[PDB]
From a paper:
The formation of the APJR homodimer occurs through a small, hydrophobic interface at the junction of transmembrane helix III (TM3) and extracellular loop 1 (ECL1), facilitated by the “FGTFF motif” (human APJR residues 97-101).
Thus, to further validate this hypothesis, we solved the cryo-EM structures of the agonistic antibody JN241-9 bound APJR in the presence or absence of Gi proteins and conducted comprehensive structural analysis. JN241-9, derived from JN241 by introducing a tyrosine residue (Y105) into the CDR3 region, exhibits full-agonist properties. The structural findings reveal that in the absence of Gi proteins, the agonistic antibody bound to APJR remains in an inactive state and predominantly exists in a dimeric state. Although in the absence of Gi proteins, the agonist antibody could effectively bind to APJR, with the pivotal residue Y105 snugly nestled in the crevice between TM4/5 and ECL2 of APJR. Intriguingly, the agonistic antibody induces predominantly dimeric APJR in the absence of Gi proteins but transitions to a monomer-prone state upon Gi proteins binding. This suggests that the coupling of Gi proteins may promote the dissociation of the APJR dimer during activation.
Author numbering:
A (entry chain D): 28 to 319
B (entry chain C): 25 to 319
C (entry chain A), D (entry chain B): 1 to 130
Write the structure that this text describes.
Amino acid sequence: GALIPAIYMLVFLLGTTGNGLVLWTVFRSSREKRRSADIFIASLAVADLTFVVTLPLWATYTYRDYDWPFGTFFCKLSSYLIFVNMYASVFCLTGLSFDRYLAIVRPVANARLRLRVSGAVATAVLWVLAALLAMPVMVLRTTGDLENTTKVQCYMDYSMVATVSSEWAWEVGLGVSSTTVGFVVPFTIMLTCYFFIAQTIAGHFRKERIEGLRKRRRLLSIIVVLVVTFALCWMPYHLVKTLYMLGSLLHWPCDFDLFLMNIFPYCTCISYVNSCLNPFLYAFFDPRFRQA
Amino acid sequence: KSSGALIPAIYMLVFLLGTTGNGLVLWTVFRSSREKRRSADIFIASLAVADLTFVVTLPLWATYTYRDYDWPFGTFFCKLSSYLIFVNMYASVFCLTGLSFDRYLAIVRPVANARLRLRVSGAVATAVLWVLAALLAMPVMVLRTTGDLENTTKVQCYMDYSMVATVSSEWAWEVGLGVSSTTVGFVVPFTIMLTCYFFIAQTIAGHFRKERIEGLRKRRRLLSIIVVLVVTFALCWMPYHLVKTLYMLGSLLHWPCDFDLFLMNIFPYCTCISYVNSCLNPFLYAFFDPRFRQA
Amino acid sequence: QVQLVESGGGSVQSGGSLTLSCAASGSTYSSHCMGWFRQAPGKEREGVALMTRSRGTSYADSVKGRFTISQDNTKNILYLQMNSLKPEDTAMYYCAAVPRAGIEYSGAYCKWNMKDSGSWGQGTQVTVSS
Amino acid sequence: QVQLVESGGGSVQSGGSLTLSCAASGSTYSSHCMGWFRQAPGKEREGVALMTRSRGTSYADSVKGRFTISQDNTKNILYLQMNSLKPEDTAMYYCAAVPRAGIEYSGAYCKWNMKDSGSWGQGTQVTVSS
Ligand SMILES: CC(C)CCC[C@@H](C)[C@H]1CC[C@H]2[C@@H]3CC=C4C[C@@H](O)CC[C@]4(C)[C@H]3CC[C@]12C
Ligand SMILES: CC(C)CCC[C@@H](C)[C@H]1CC[C@H]2[C@@H]3CC=C4C[C@@H](O)CC[C@]4(C)[C@H]3CC[C@]12C
């Protein structure tokens, strides 16, 4: 009942404070001391802040038993910002992993690619892609008294772009594309980069060289922990959602569908918790945020 | 006449211009080195922050006025938006008062200026300024609500006095809040500014008969931009406070219905000018102050 | 706070141009809002003619008839020119003075949602005959 | 797209325990969330038992408690146990399936606001005797 709104408000407070401190730390250091990964760190913090500012609205939404007293525009904006957080965060993790892959397997090629493609253009393309990919959510989201109750539910209307028969097709396509470009393809790139990184690192890890683990814990392992936490917080979301979509063609039993429907709010809750979890991860492993 | 879509078009235009200009002036006052940042710069930045917070909600008010005063945003956002208009008013007037007092220290008594700078830091003054603005605009946030007044199927963001007063005391609380807002936003701060400026003008005549040309030129630039800001505030918010004070005083003076209707119909445009002041500030900063002009 | 004294009404045949003049004392145009209501069989107090800043003389559709609102500030009487007496007009017609809101916050709206807490007056029993 | 061939419609007297079994084809419990609707003669089609997700099974408060509705995902047949049928319940009964949205956006809710753009059946009039 009140557990989800309470966790949403706690994540709101913790994420706002932690992302504010992360932004302050990344934006107080001199440009020379600011690494190429700091832009990605700050973009992750900005996405987390942009989501947690709307988090109180969602906490009120779930507190009132899925009633939305904020309007169609704010439903559109909030859903837009959840999706923008998802794509921007996973694209930033992809960029961090690709940067580390360049810096490890082929550092000369890392310098070459950094010279060819600056950080600013990469970040701008990342955010433009996130915006354009979350455009369907903003376009189609609406508020309506679904189930003919006093509650106002912030849902997505497919009548603008599809009929009743094609509404299912558009829903499945949007879900599949969101999964593909937010978990499947970006994580595929991340595991490819991490596998090449693992080969290059193991080339020396076959020896003892335990100081290499601390050197990784500085930047590479904090990036790895960020990726792993993102995976563990968005795997319930995408897994349950994809299973629900596939149930129409696998003909799942009613019990399994009901279990997925009932457990999806908690999966969403963990996916939202990740935003506040990230600054704590920064403090625990990276001493730069701990020092500042 | 409702002027059709004039009020929402103006509101959206000031939204865009104010957002861009206030972002530009914040960037100008923040990119400079801390040593070059003078004590007036924190006041400039605080005024810019107040304007930015107001023009953030400006699209909401534009939508409100576009739909014939219908508010599809909820009680919380009505409270927050009204709170932010009032916070902008108090913070802006207090920042202008702080700038004028900083000048009154600088020109009239420079030794006392240094003494008061040593005694009182700018950060403490800004913090007290914002705390007072928040507390004084708190009644707006507490008592505001959304309701379909006149039963026209249109939510209107009004202020409810039933929480703290009865029907026979609703008028008392309304007049008290209006008079207090008028006082601490246009009379007492402005009385402080006029006293400071009168002493400043006496010292300016003295510097017409004394002082140094180069320091007088630097003071000319700074006092010119500051006084232009003060006069623009005093010309954009004067219709607001004047018309609302006249409306309150009408119950005591028993004015004809024609004058009351004129005030009621002209108040939206006074609100327009008061809102346009926020976007007017960056253009003023660019025109007179070379620091923003250089950036 | 104000004292409202109604007039007119009564048993009049259909089609008459009955005039309902709701007087007032202390209820200025800039302070309180005139309005006209009639009591439902369940005493629901259905509005018949209200004064509105957004619209001005908002008449209920079901109680349209030929109702007219005119406010005289000098004599402080609201007139309900409820011409063309309808069979629906057979009701007790009351006038209310719901305090008008301020210009600063509510834009001088008339706060008709607070009709329960407003000041009323003992109406007249209109009995529209044939 | 679901062909809701609703059966079991009949006619009883006061207190009748008629059971309405709306069969369906293609309306999986995950895709289409079906419910029952009652169309009163001369008026728009109303609701009796609209199966939802937030409230579980919903009802019409004017007639709530007289009938029970349950769904079997095995044979995809929806029951409307119209027990204690009353003369106020004399009307036509339609069974419909609005397309239930996904969990990602609407939390798997039954878009009963789109009952107009949904698949319908035929039903049979229940002339409940007094
Ligand atoms: C519930 C309904 C009625 C509310 C409608 C609000 C609409 C009309 C308003 C509120 C906020 C507004 C937006 C605020 C900011 C921007 C960014 C700017 O670069 C382009 C315009 C744009 C995108 C505005 C377009 C109009 C807008 C979306
Ligand atoms: C229309 C109604 C139902 C919406 C209700 C929204 C309320 C319950 C929510 C939305 C925004 C929230 C606020 C967001 C930020 C802060 C600042 C923090 O330092 C104290 C809590 C406080 C002040 C929150 C309190 C609860 C809050 C006011």
